[PDB]
Amino acid sequence: IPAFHPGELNVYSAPGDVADVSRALRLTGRRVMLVPTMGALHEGHLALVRAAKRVPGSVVVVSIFVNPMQFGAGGDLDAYPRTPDDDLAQLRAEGVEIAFTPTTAAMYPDGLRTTVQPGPLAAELEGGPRPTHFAGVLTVVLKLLQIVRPDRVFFGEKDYQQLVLIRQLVADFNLDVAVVGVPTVREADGLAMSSRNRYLDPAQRAAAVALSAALTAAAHAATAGAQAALDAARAVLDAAPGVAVDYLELRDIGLGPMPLNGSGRLLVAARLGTTRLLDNIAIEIGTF
Amino acid sequence: MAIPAFHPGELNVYSAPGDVADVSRALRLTGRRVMLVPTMGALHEGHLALVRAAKRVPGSVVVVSIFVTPDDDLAQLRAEGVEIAFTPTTAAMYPDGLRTTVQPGPLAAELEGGPRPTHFAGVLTVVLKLLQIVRPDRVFFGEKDYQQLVLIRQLVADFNLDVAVVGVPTVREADGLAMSSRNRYLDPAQRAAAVALSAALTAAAHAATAGAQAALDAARAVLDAAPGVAVDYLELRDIGLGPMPLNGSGRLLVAARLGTTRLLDNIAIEIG
Ligand SMILES: COc1ccc2c(c1)cc(C(=O)NS(=O)(=O)Cc1ccccc1)n2CC(=O)O
Ligand SMILES: COc1ccc2c(c1)cc(C(=O)NS(=O)(=O)Cc1ccccc1)n2CC(=O)O
Numbered sequence: 001i002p003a004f005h006p007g008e009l010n011v012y013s014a015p016g017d018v019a020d021v022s023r024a025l026r027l028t029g030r031r032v033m034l035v036p037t038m039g040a041l042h043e044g045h046l047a048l049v050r051a052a053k054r055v056p057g058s059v060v061v062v063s064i065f066v067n068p069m070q071f072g073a074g075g076d077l078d079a080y081p082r083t084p085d086d087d088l089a090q091l092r093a094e095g096v097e098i099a100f101t102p103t104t105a106a107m108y109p110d111g112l113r114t115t116v117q118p119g120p121l122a123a124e125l126e127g128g129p130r131p132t133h134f135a136g137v138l139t140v141v142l143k144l145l146q147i148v149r150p151d152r153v154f155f156g157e158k159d160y161q162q163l164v165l166i167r168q169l170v171a172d173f174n175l176d177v178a179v180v181g182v183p184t185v186r187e188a189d190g191l192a193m194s195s196r197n198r199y200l201d202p203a204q205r206a207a208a209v210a211l212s213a214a215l216t217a218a219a220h221a222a223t224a225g226a227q228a229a230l231d232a233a234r235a236v237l238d239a240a241p242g243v244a245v246d247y248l249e250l251r252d253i254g255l256g257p258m259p260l261n262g263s264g265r266l267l268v269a270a271r272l273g274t275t276r277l278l279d280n281i282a283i284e285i286g287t288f
Numbered sequence: 289m290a291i292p293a294f295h296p297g298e299l300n301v302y303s304a305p306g307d308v309a310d311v312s313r314a315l316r317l318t319g320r321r322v323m324l325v326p327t328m329g330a331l332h333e334g335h336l337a338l339v340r341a342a343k344r345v346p347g348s349v350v351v352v353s354i355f356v357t358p359d360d361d362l363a364q365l366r367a368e369g370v371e372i373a374f375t376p377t378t379a380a381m382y383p384d385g386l387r388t389t390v391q392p393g394p395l396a397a398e399l400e401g402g403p404r405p406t407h408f409a410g411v412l413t414v415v416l417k418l419l420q421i422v423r424p425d426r427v428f429f430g431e432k433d434y435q436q437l438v439l440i441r442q443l444v445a446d447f448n449l450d451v452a453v454v455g456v457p458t459v460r461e462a463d464g465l466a467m468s469s470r471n472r473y474l475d476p477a478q479r480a481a482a483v484a485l486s487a488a489l490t491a492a493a494h495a496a497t498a499g500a501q502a503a504l505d506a507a508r509a510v511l512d513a514a515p516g517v518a519v520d521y522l523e524l525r526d527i528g529l530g531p532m533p534l535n536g537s538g539r540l541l542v543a544a545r546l547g548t549t550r551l552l553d554n555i556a557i558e559i560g
């Protein structure tokens with residue numbers, strides 16, 4: 001149990017430290033909230049913090065870890081945006097009491113050994129060309145949940161596939177934590193917040209509005225059915241300069257092995273130059 | 289809201305994972321230390337030595353989980369002073385079927401993982417589940433299935449689980465035959481030959497003063513003196529089942545087929 005100073009930012013690197021502090025806090029009555037991040041915080045991460053802060057008597061733990069296990073690919077890992085000085089400044093400004101910034105050796109001292117194997121959802125959509133990506137993410141999430149043992153854990157809905165697989169993890173391994181999904185924070189034109197928006201030049205930043213415009217078009221077109229919703233989104237993506245579409249798909253909300261009913265999720269992934277952007281929205285089909 | 293009924297000092301049986309989760313949490317909060325003894329199949333004396341080990345921790349409450357007479361076994365647990373039996377159905381354990389699972393590391397592909405290549409995935413996935421449902425302070429396994437025990441310690445380390453893994457020395461028949469549900473099927477000639485497994489290993493552990501080669505050849509000799517004993521492997525490893533270091537502590541493992549039954553044994557070895 002290292003020093004805990006309430007009402008300021010305590011930073012721990014050692015998993016044993018954050019674990020002992022967390023358990024200490026839980027035993028004295030505070031509910032522990034966890035917000036997993038990979039750093040490069042934007043207003044989207046701040047919204048997760050602010051959701052966690054609203055839980056009465058919460059202490060909020062933000063983890064910052066760029067997880068080598070979920071990455072490809074030669075250069076993807078090294079190219080990840082890292083800005084930890086601006087990261088800790090914002091958390092201090094939001095009143096966060098705990099930041100957990102582990103080293104790679106402390107998370108993976110034996111290298112990759114026991115891992116989480118996701119269900120078949122991890123091979124679809126984002127997982128199609130990146131077969132071990134979601135095993136890497138579910139493995140780090142499980143370890144975070146075990147080190148921190150929060151009551152609730154918060155994720156954005158922007159990476160909706162990820163959030164769904166995380167729900168499966170929690171359910172399938174009987175984890176005793178409530179998973180809270182927070183609606184995607186957007187730029188004023190509709191662009192979903194993402195660490196990788198900084199890679200759009202001014203022309204690409206202009207075209208990028210097409211994704212959220214396509215999804216909202218579809219969500220309104222959907223009174224007329226699935227075909228009309230998809231055709232609306234496709235038309236908007238087509239009218240946009242150098243948007244290259246990787247997929248546009250409408251699925252049940254659990255994304256599972258079941259057909260679409262009245263409520264669905266429309267997901268899109270597109271490339272602007274070298275930058276791959278994702279977005280998604282709730283869709284109600286027909287009568288609703 | 290309400291915690292399920294629990295009556296201290298008696299045998300309380302729950303089939304619902306949420307029920308045992310709630311009661312275990314209530315128990316931990318009033319002070320007791322929760323010990324978990326997982327079992328499967330009909331109860332044998334190896335499982336009972338796990339219970340007795342668990343029962344000796346002061347302030348413990350002992351949880352025995354059971355995967356498939358059932359009332360005779362429950363009466364044994366009652367006679368051992370166990371206060372909780374967790375007896376879930378497959379549907380309760382897998383309400384969404386097989387979905388997210390544990391993938392063991394490369395150890396699972398060696399030794400027993402050769403004939404049964406996904407067996408350890410199943411075992412680690414169900415132990416992980418049992419651990420999250422019960423959240424024990426200590427969890428108890430026999431040393432008998434030593435490869436399983438090592439895999440579970442890796443699971444606990446790699447997934448940062450809070451629990452102490454306690455391995456309990458293997459209960460043996462009076463001639464040394466390691467306890468196993470399979471022993472009941474051996475005919476007299478197989479039962480007699482099966483002593484060669486433990487006799488080999490203990491000869492090896494004593495030959496070990498003369499070095500690792502002497503220890504291996506002693507075991508191989510004892511195995512070669514038994515008829516009808518088809519040896520699958522005889523392997524000397526370090527205690528974590530990596531390569532045996534030139535001296536220090538180790539484990540010697542054997543598996544063999546006698547007729548239709550596969551038997552396994554292992555033992556601590558100290559080189560030199
Ligand atoms: C509430 O509004 C939003 C909007 C977007 C968000 C978020 C919130 C959060 C993220 C984000 O990147 N989350 S994460 O993948 O880094 C969370 C995470 C961290 C570690 C393991 C698994 C998941 N992102 C997306 C992104 O930065 O690309
Ligand atoms: C339904 O869920 C629970 C959970 C824990 C419970 C009980 C019920 C009952 C007890 C218990 O100890 N009852 S007791 O009369 O033997 C002792 C006792 C009395 C008053 C305060 C604390 C413990 N205990 C604590 C125990 O068995 O050690």
Ligand SMILES: COc1ccc2c(c1)cc(C(=O)NS(=O)(=O)Cc1ccccc1)n2CC(=O)O
Pocket residue numbers: 326327328329333334335337338355411414415429430431432433456457458459466467468469
């Ligand atoms: C202290 O001495 C012993 C001796 C032999 C033992 C045991 C203890 C325990 C077992 C045993 O059968 N363990 S188990 O397969 O029932 C444990 C288990 C339970 C549930 C899921 C996975 C593993 N066995 C037999 C065996 O491992 O095949």
